[PDB]
């Protein structure tokens, strides 16, 4: 500014001017920005930034590309000076800075935040993950305008941050002025004083790419005025910034947004797609350490593969997730099945159901003295957005989390309004609840409603309620000892993810009538043993679709509704 520019600034500003003269894709874009602003001013805004495609910068200039990648403090500046000069030259009407943004592949600069260390400080870092906290929007002080009243005129003195500079200039403070020259009181005016707002968000690594079992490492992003309305907790994000250490990143570009598949594994899953004996052996091959319970793991197989997640036009979305509650005597392997479903799914989060430090799983409030304010902590269900969560000891879970899962069940989301924030989050996850009775034991002669120790709304929320009995019987109990005294794990994961990514099933007339007949025949159970609701209609075709996608057919069949009715007869009677 005040210093004389050398050839080290002039050469870089003429190289960026030559790159902008070669590629008119940013010049017509900033002309579109200006004509949109002129049309809105004529009717009476966009936050003045142009995303630059990095693929045109590698083949045009290798040294400029290398200088951007190793010294952005000496390379970003002159490029934004060229952009402001191009914005002044492209406009010819009378009468603010302009910023930049990048996109594309980075190579070794794109990395996990747990691997982000003290190396490559000055170089720009692209890092993806999940956000945990989003602070309160706070306006700062820049250019306050003061009015001296006895002589009647305006004064103005501006301030400077020590981060928003991406480079170097002399730094020093200045007292917020309270007395003009010689000495007569003067008043403040905030009508014209700018209040650039800033934000401070936290982002850690994603649970699917990280080596799960370890601790997540989070970093802080300081945010400007422009991009303050595009951040919310619970979403997968990819930030692009500069790792400055006065350690934080000066995030300029934010983009809101796993086994490898070969061509030999696709031949094996295409070979196993037309045999009609696949489902039973795939349900039997998940846990060989647990004797019996075939239909329960058949429903667990249909549960971990998923649904369809149908989004209606101009209306609310439809629930694709399925939910399973399992009750019975505490003698069997209900606590041993959660470790298997946690270690064999795509991504899964297991909680004990009692012991959450916050208000539950979904979130918690915290105070920070850094900002001197209150931030949000995301404990669980907001991390897994497409996977599964497992809660054992469901009866020990309090009413606050029960009210929370009453709302996020069919809703498939959540909402929070708190001191200084109001928002709604989306989280379509699937729950696996395991409970125990309050009497300790249960037999067939006791009634099946009071033994559950849960309200009727929670029985209506959960789709499949599986009762496991363990009365002592000498005939069946003879082979458990030799069975526990005596297809694979990396194949079903690839099977489930290929079915989840490629094939979406649709309905046919052959499977609508049989499920209509089954729903109308059960709507019998109301007079004999269990209430049937409208939500159950939806869950009776979800499972069918499931089976139809287990066989990966493009549409459903009648046998999918038949195996769903067989699962219903086992879990209801």
């Amino acid at each position: 500014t005040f210093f004389a520019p050398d050839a080290v600034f002039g050469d870089r500003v003429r190289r960026f001017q030559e790159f902008l003269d070669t590629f008119t894709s940013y010049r017509d874009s900033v002309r579109s920005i200006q004509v949109y602003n002129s049309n809105n001013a004529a009717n009476y805004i966009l936050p003045h930034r142009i995303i630059i495609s990095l693929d045109d910068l590698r083949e045009f200039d290798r040294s400029f590309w290398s200088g951007i990648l190793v010294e952005p403090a000496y390379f970003i500046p002159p490029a934004e000076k060229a952009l402001t000069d191009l914005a002044d030259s492209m406009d010819d009407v009378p009468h603010h800075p302009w910023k930049l943004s990048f996109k594309g592949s980075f190579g070794a600069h794109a990395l996990s935040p747990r691997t982000l260390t003290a190396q490559h400080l000055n170089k720009l870092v692209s890092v993806e993950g999940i956000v945990t906290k989003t602070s309160l929007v706070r306006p700062k002080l820049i250019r306050s305008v003061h009015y001296a009243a006895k002589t009647g005129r305006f004064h103005y003195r501006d301030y400077t941050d020590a981060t928003t500079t991406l480079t170097t200039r002399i730094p020093t403070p200045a007292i917020y002025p309270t007395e003009d020259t010689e000495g007569n009181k003067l008043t403040t005016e905030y009508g014209y004083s700018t209040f650039i707002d800033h934000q401070r968000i936290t982002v850690q690594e994603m649970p699917e790419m990280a080596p799960a079992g370890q601790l997540p490492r989070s970093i802080d992003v300081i945010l400007d005025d422009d991009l303050v309305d595009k951040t919310k907790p619970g979403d997968r994000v990819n930030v692009v910034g500069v790792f400055k250490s006065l350690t934080l990143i000066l995030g300029n570009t934010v983009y809101p947004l796993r086994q490898m598949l070969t061509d030999f594994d696709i031949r094996n899953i295409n070979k196993l797609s037309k045999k009609k004996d696949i489902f039973d052996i795939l349900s039997q091959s998940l846990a060989p350490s647990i004797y019996g319970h075939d239909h329960i793991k058949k429903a667990i197989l249909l549960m971990l593969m998923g649904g369809v997640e149908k989004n209606l036009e101009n209306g609310s979305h439809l629930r694709g997730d399925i939910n399973i509650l399992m009750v019975g005597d505490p003698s069997t392997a209900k606590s041993q099945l959660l470790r298997f479903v946690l270690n064999t799914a795509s991504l899964a989060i297991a909680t004990t159901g009692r012991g959450s430090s916050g208000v539950g799983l979904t979130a918690a409030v915290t105070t920070d003295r850094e900002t001197g304010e209150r931030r949000l902590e995301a404990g669980a269900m907001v991390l897994a957005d497409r996977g599964v969560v497992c809660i054992d000891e469901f009866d020990k879970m309090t009413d606050v989390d029960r009210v929370a899962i009453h709302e996020v069940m069919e809703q498939q989301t959540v909402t929070i309004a708190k001191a200084g924030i109001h928002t709604t989050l989306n989280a379509r996850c699937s729950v696996i609840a395991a409970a125990n009775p309050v009497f300790g034991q249960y037999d067939v002669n006791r009634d099946p409603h009071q033994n559950i120790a849960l309200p009727d709304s929670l029985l209506s929320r959960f789709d499949l309620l599986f009762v496991v009995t363990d009365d002592i019987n000498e005939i069946r109990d003879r082979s458990i000892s030799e069975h526990v005294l005596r297809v694979t794990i990396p194949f079903l994961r690839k099977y489930v993810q290929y079915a989840k990514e490629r094939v979406i099933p649709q309905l046919t007339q052959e499977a609508i009538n049989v499920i209509v007949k089954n729903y109308t025949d059960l709507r019998d159970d109301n007079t004999k043993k269990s209430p049937i609701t409208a939500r159950t209609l939806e869950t009776l075709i979800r499972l069918a679709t499931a089976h139809a996608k287990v066989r990966l057919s493009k549409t459903v069949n009648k046998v999918d509704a038949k195996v769903a009715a067989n699962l219903l007869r086992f879990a209801l009677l």
Binding site: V145, T188, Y190, Y192, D197, I416, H422
Partner: protein, 231 residues
């Protein structure tokens, strides 16, 4: 932006009004000189009509409506002295009145923007200092309380009563004497406060809430704080 000609425009506006007794602003000054009212309401419609009268006669407009809309806190302390420069004689710190503003409607906006119905989600951050018209329900209100503006201190040694101006929520008592007689003296005698000569204001805080159909899909109606003073 200049103040030397805009203040002349402000003091020329209040004496040359015939569009809506006679010169109504001078009649309102006669009414405040008769001590019957304490509130001054300034509209932008009279400003627009005076601007039209000045623009149709070939004179320079030097726009007020594009300057009142930004930094009205400087304008409420700057135009107040222009009102204070001329008052009629009565027939029946020294601010007898209270100055307030009101914007122009959409009917005066289509007939040759500044007053749009704004949401609290439509605040963006950068509107801190613009006049805004917010629509919403009111859930939280507080009681009327007297907030001081200037603290009056009296002395028995010199007699010169001093007045300090507070701006924040809190302040400190100026026990040290800053008069024009105690500077050239060895003695620095005690000062006392006056709750009668000090100017107060009827302060009240309120929480405006976001309208129900104006909130987006899934979002919750967040609040905002409004600090009112006077009448």
């Amino acid at each position: 932006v200049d103040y030397n000609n805009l203040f002349n425009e402000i003091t020329d506006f209040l004496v040359t009004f015939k569009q809506d007794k006679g010169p109504k602003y001078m009649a309102m000054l006669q009414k405040v000189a008769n001590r019957e009212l304490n509130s001054v309401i300034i509209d932008l419609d009279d400003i627009l009509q005076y601007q039209n009268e000045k623009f149709l006669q070939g004179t320079q407009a030097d726009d007020l409506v594009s300057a009142i809309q930004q930094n009205a806190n400087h304008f409420t302390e700057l135009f107040c002295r222009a009102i204070d420069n001329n008052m009629p004689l009565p027939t029946k710190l020294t601010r007898r009145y209270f100055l307030y503003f009101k914007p122009l409607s959409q009917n005066c906006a289509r007939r040759y923007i500044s007053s749009k119905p704004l949401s609290v989600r439509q605040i963006k951050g950068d509107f801190l200092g613009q006049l805004i018209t917010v629509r919403g329900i009111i859930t939280r209100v507080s009681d009327v309380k007297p907030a001081v503006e200037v603290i009056a201190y009296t002395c028995d040694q010199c007699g010169y009563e001093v007045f300090q101006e507070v701006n924040s929520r809190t302040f400190t008592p100026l026990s040290e004497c800053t008069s024009e007689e105690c500077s050239q003296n060895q003695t620095k005698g005690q000062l006392f406060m006056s709750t009668r000569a000090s100017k107060f204001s009827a302060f009240q805080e309120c929480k405006i809430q976001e309208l129900s159909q104006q909130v987006p899909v899934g979002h919750i109606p967040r609040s905002l704080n409004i600090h009112v003073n006077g009448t």
